[PDB]
Structure 1
Amino acid sequence: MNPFASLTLTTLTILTIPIMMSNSNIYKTNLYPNYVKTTVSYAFTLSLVPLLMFMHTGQEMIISNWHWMTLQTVELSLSFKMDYFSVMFIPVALFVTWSIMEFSMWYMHSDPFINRFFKYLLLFLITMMILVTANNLFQLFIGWEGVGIMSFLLIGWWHGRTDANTAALQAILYNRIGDIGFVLSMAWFLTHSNAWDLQQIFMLNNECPNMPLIGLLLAAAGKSAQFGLHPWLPSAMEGPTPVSALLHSSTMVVAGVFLLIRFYPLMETNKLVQTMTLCLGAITTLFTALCAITQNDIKKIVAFSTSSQLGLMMVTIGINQPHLAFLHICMHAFFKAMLFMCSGSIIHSLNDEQDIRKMGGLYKAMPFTTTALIIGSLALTGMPYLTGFYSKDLIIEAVNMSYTNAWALLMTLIATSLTAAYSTRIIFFAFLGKPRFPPLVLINENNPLLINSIKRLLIGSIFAGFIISNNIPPMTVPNTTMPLYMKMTALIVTIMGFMLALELNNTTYYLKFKYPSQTYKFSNMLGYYPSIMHRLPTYHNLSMSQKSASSLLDLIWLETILPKTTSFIQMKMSIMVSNQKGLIKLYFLSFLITIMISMTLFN
């Protein structure tokens, strides 16, 4: 039959062979990480073929290979959707994972359980590939939960650390809050459309009601860390830097956005859910950029940048532009993965130090990391003809040229300013000044693994936007004509952010000191959202679950009602009946009374 179908299934299948060999002898040797890396590279170069076929003719398939249980009129089968989104995202994710694994062989070299780390990385990749290619809601739920469990296991990688376990349970909690909406959507779609299959859902819903779309939006908000459910993504930086670069930066966290992309035929028929998506994205991007511009942990800054980018993706979905959101996912993967890789290089060279107050002049001390981070920041802020340009410029133009909320547009523009601001914050505080790290200089970049893994994603961050944008077919009408100023809005906002943040950073050299303002405090403690919301509800829950449910009802009143009352009643009745002093006088008096009662009562 057609080759296109075989290649798509072979990529996913050969991704699983190292998991099968995890019980073999190679898992006991030091060659296992290289084996996993080689497998992932081969899968990437094999998956490049269906992408070429789609770029040529646009080949599309559904592969329902295995029939799993059938539920009366509902048939469940193992089915894979190999549309443009799948055949475009699979090579990008495989490329990013290849670079991340090559980086990890240098970053996690001293870790005793490095084979288990790679086994874990591969399991996450498999679950994410299951999530992306799923054709029905049950398989997509399988991938949804698998990536969550893998993130739980990889955040709490150092399980002797209390904060790592706290962060892992936090991620699980917020993702279950989203899973409520996911399960609501599944129940609605089965009850009304009689299917979890995507084709039947699209066919039978010409005008989709509010409830299933609101469930989908809740699931997306949970898994993409939108404003109501945001803190778990910054808290997830407890895991090793490769985990932060792969899962919580570019691949797993876009899953929620991808879900809204996967259901876009139904989303475009509902104005209320579109408006909710747009507003949620706008508030998320603004709030997370505002938190970012004042952080001191470099990984925290990059995580807040990731959350802002996800909010921008949600804004793009809310303005009814799903393909542009997918393109942003693909571009952000490249440059944000490289950003975390550069951050991890800095952290390793400075003896596991993550605070920017203790890193000074690294522009010359370690120059390949410097140039890679500069390129990544220029791609992130949006510099013409780089990878981030071909997506973000169109995002801003589309939001400007659309019938949207004025508040959402304003928040998006301010978030672009703040993106430039925290990018220049990282550069200024980590590369420009005098050194502020301890005297024993252990700075070293000379490892082929680190250099090669970073430079592959550097070439990606330079050219992938141009190549992909020029190879995919047009999926939307262009915004050909604009006012000149409104065409230049993104660049002027970015320049204003750069200049104002640079000016405000240059005053730290002055010999004057003053106490901070309330705005600074609000920005630094993350709007105080993690404080209040991680102390007030939890306490009130836990306290209640011991005071009322456990002690008041279960240990006291439910015990008082049935068993204790019965015991008391029977005890008193027994004590009354048995307590006779053995005086037959009283016995025969009772006999006379009952004799006369029997004579006067039953006749």
Structure 2
Amino acid sequence: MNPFASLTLTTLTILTIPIMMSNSNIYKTNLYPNYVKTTVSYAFTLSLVPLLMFMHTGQEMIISNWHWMTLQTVELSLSFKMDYFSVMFIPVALFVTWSIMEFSMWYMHSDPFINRFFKYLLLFLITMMILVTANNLFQLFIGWEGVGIMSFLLIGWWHGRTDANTAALQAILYNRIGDIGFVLSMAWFLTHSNAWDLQQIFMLNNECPNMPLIGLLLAAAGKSAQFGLHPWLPSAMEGPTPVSALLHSSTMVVAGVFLLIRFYPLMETNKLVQTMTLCLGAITTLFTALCAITQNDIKKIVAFSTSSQLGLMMVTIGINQPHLAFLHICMHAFFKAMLFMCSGSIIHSLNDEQDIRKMGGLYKAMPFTTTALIIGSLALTGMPYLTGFYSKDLIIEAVNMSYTNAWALLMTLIATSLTAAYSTRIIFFAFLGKPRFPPLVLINENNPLLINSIKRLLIGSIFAGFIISNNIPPMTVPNTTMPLYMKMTALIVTIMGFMLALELNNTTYYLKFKYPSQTYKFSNMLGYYPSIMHRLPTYHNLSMSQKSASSLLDLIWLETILPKTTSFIQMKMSIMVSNQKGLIKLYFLSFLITIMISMTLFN
């Protein structure tokens, strides 16, 4: 009876078995990575069944199995939510993780600590499953912090490198800035609604006030790398390529957008929070695309692409289309994970080279990665009838036909054009020109793990969009009618971006040199935000931490007031009392004076 709950819990629990076995003998052999990969594939195959049951019937469930503690009138229990979002996002994440692990078995073969890398990946996967399936705010916070800790531990994978540690600390700092708003939201919800459970929160909040939603938006901006707190995501590429492909591309970074999606009953009741979300998403996507258009590191460009897609999804949330944002999450997972996988294959085949200035003719030298990246870039740019079209096209149609900010609409259009433009830049600078790498050619794709892992994501990015779009029940009203020019606006702007980017890139062939302009310097240096914001605030804080707090107050004035003043006064009194020459003349003169004073004073 009730196979749905049993299977939904079983996939999560069997994701945990290798963690327990990590203390056994298998962890000390070379079969551990294959063991973890097989476990993940089996979990995905098992979790495919609840998705089918939901698709056939619409089955929904919440499981409150273990009661943690009762604080007077508030009961905290281990509650799991198995709604549409959870049972739909488990298989996608599991499939992506399986592909990334199969890729890692080949990419990280030379790492002495590869079993630890695989167990770290599995721990991150478990934390993300906890975050996604959480039904109360406490479990959601547990997952929220677990994914952050796993990202911190995986970014600084190479402890010798200082830059990796700096990037990990930066990510922790920005995630804690988001955690401030998350804790604000939890505190307000428990103070007012008297429950961290989502059901009671939805029942007791007919019109949600500004404060809890502002806190949720702050947390979502913190973890999704919105414009205010963006640089940590581009900085997080110091870690190994699989970490960026799994964590900081498709799974962990969409957690803030998923948090905003989970609270869609409360988001539709507030109109100012929607405007703030729309503006934040628009500025994020535009700024990240403008930064990406002029970068030279492939990983940095793909990271900025991920940030732009996250900003677009935040725009979608701001225009009151949560299900469409979730759909875009699902498609972006596939194609962006495959894009990072192709980039990692290029880097590995090219002797640990990431800069595109030393990447030349790879269209023929290594064709499978070339065609995979071409398919992924076409899916990214919303080419019709691909995995990205069925989400991004609807995003554009919804944002064009909505009573929203016009500036945000313009920013979204320019962001899509710039997305097409830097996809063109990647293809042109990595696969079209003459070779520019060192003469010792070591290009090789002939490994079954790499080929199979890439081909699964190819099949995904080709057909999964159609399958998902045609196999889910409708959850929003369609834009049935459309102006002919407005219908093609996304396609027109994307084609215009292709044309302009290609025309501007083809000018580098010319035998003409010119110094960069102000706009190029602004865009190449990431808008100067990483410089100023990492030098002006921190220094000042650090300076104060030693000037006022440490030296001036703690070590000087707090020491002077109570203890040192007392010591000085007592020393002076002791000196005055004990400074007697030993003359009885003075002693008995004082005796006469006190005898005289007592009779007058006390009589």
TM-score by length of 1: 1.00
What is the CA distance between 1:599 and its match in structure 2? Answer: 0.5
Shift in Å, 1:286:
0.2
Instruction: Return the offset for 1:482.
Output: 1.0
Task: Give the whole-Å Cα distance in 1 for the aligned partners of 2:75 and 2:161.
Answer: 46
Name the counterpart of 1:537: 537
- 1:70 and 1:383 map into 2 onto residues whose CA distance is 53
Cα distance in structure 1, aligned partners of 2:596 and 2:482:
112
For 1:426 and 1:158, the matched residues in 2 are separated by 27
Return the alpha-carbon distance in structure 2 between the equivalents of residues 43 and 14 of structure 1: 7
Question: Cα deviations across residues 529-576 of structure 1 (Å, max 9, x unaligned)?
Answer: 000000000000000000000000000000000000000000000000
CA deviations on 1:209-244 (whole Å, 9 max, x unpaired) are: 000000000000000000000000000000100000
C-alpha distance in structure 2 between counterparts of 1:311 and 1:183, whole Å: 23
Between the aligned partners of 2:305 and 2:59, the Cα distance in structure 1 is: 35
Equivalent in the alignment of 2:519: 519
Residue 317 of structure 1 and its aligned partner are, at CA, apart by 0.1
* Partner Cα distance (2:482, 2:102) in 1: 45
Per-residue deviation at 1:100? 0.1
Query: 1:123-165, CA deviations, whole angstroms, 9 ceiling, x for partnerless residues?
Result: 0000000000000000000000000000000000000000000
Quote the Cα distance in structure 2 between the aligned partners of 1:386 and 1:75. 46
Q: State the Cα distance separating 1:431 from its structure 2 match.
A: 0.2
1:348 deviates by 0.3
Measure, in 2, the Cα distance between the counterparts of 1:243 and 1:29: 22
What is the SS of the residue equivalent to 2:22? helix
- Gaps of at least 5 residues in structure 2 are none
The secondary structure found in structure 2 opposite 1:361 is coil
Give the superposition deviation at 1:502: 0.1
1:76-133 Cα shifts (integer Å, max 9, x gaps): 0000000000000000000000000000000000000000000000000000000000
| Count of paired positions | 603
Q: In 2, distance between residues paired with 1:449 and 1:577?
A: 90
Residue by residue over 1:384-428, the C-alpha shift from the partner in whole angstroms, topping out at 9 and shown as x without a partner, is 110000000000000000001000000000000000000000000
Alpha-carbon shift at residue 204 of structure 1 (Å): 0.2
Cα distance between partner residues in 2 of 1:545 and 1:392: 47
Separation in 2, partners of 1:380, 1:484: 23
Q: Gaps (5+ residues) in structure 1?
A: none
Q: Please report how far the alpha carbon of residue 518 of structure 1 lies from its aligned counterpart in structure 2 after TM superposition.
A: 0.3
- Mapped to 2, the partners of 1:434 and 1:145 lie a distance apart of 46
Superposed CA RMSD in Å reads: 0.3
After superposition, the C-alpha distances for 1:342-388 in whole angstroms (9 at most, x for unaligned) are 00000000000000000000000000000000000000001111000
Aligned-partner Cα distance in 2 for 1:64–1:521: 55
Aligned to 1:216: 216
Post-superposition Cα deviations, 1:444-500, rounded to whole Å, max 9, x if no partner, equal 000000000000000000000000000110000000001100000000000000000
Tell me the distance in 2 between the aligned counterparts of 1:398 and 1:597.
99
Q: Give deviations 1:296-329, integer Å, cap 9, x for gaps.
A: 0000000000000000000000000000000000
- In 2, the alpha carbon distance for the partners of 1:349 and 1:11 equals 35
2:253 is paired with a residue of what secondary structure? Answer: coil
Measure, in 2, the Cα distance between the counterparts of 1:250 and 1:573: 73
In the alignment, what sits opposite 1:136?
A: 136
Distance 1:476 1:349 in 2: 45
**CA distances 1:167-225 after superposition (whole Å, capped 9, x unpaired):** 00000000000000000000000000000000000000000000000000000000000
Residue by residue, what CA displacement relative to the aligned partner does 1:22-66 show, whole Å, maximum 9, x if unpaired? 000000000000000000000000000000000000000000000
Q: Distance in 2 between matches of 1:484 and 1:113?
A: 57
Which residue does the alignment assign to 1:394?
Answer: 394
Distance, in Å, in 2 between the alignment partners of 1:149 and 1:94 is 20
Cα offset, 1:436, TM superposition: 0.2
Q: Percent same amino acid at aligned positions?
A: 100
In structure 1, distance between residues paired with 2:57 and 2:470: 15
Q: Distance in 1 between matches of 2:425 and 2:497?
A: 11
Q: Secondary structure at the match of 2:515?
A: coil
Cα distance in 1 for partners of 2:448, 2:314 equals: 38
> How far apart, CA to CA, are the structure 2 residues paired with 1:225 and 1:211?
21
Output the CA distance in 2 between the equivalents of 1:265 and 1:522.
40
TM-superposed CA distance for 1:12, in Å, is: 0.1
Tell me the secondary structure at the aligned position of residue 69 of structure 1. strand
Aligned to 2:595: 595
The 3-state SS of whatever aligns with 1:23 is: coil
Alignment of 1:172-187 (within 5 A): 172-187=172-187
Give, in angstroms, the shift of residue 511 of structure 1.
0.1
- CA–CA separation in structure 1 for the residues paired with 2:20 and 2:311: 38
Detail structure 1 runs of 4+ shifted over 2 Å in the superposition.
Answer: none
Counterpart of 1:375 in structure 2 is 375
Give TM-score, length-normalised by structure 2. Answer: 1.00
Write the deviation string for residues 247-285 of structure 1: whole angstroms up to 9, x where unpaired: 000000000000000000000000000000000000000
Q: Which residue does 1:202 correspond to in 2?
A: 202
Task: Tell me how far apart the structure 1 counterparts of residues 113 and 226 of structure 2 sit (CA, whole Å).
Answer: 34
* Whole-angstrom CA distance in 2 between matches of 1:322 and 1:312: 12
Counterpart of 2:278 in 1: which secondary structure? Answer: helix
Q: In the aligned structure 2, how far is the partner of 1:193 from the partner of 1:391?
A: 35
Name the SS for the 2:404 alignment partner: coil
**Partners in 1 of 2:377 and 2:189 — Cα distance?**
42
- 2: CA distance between counterparts of 1:563 and 1:67? 52
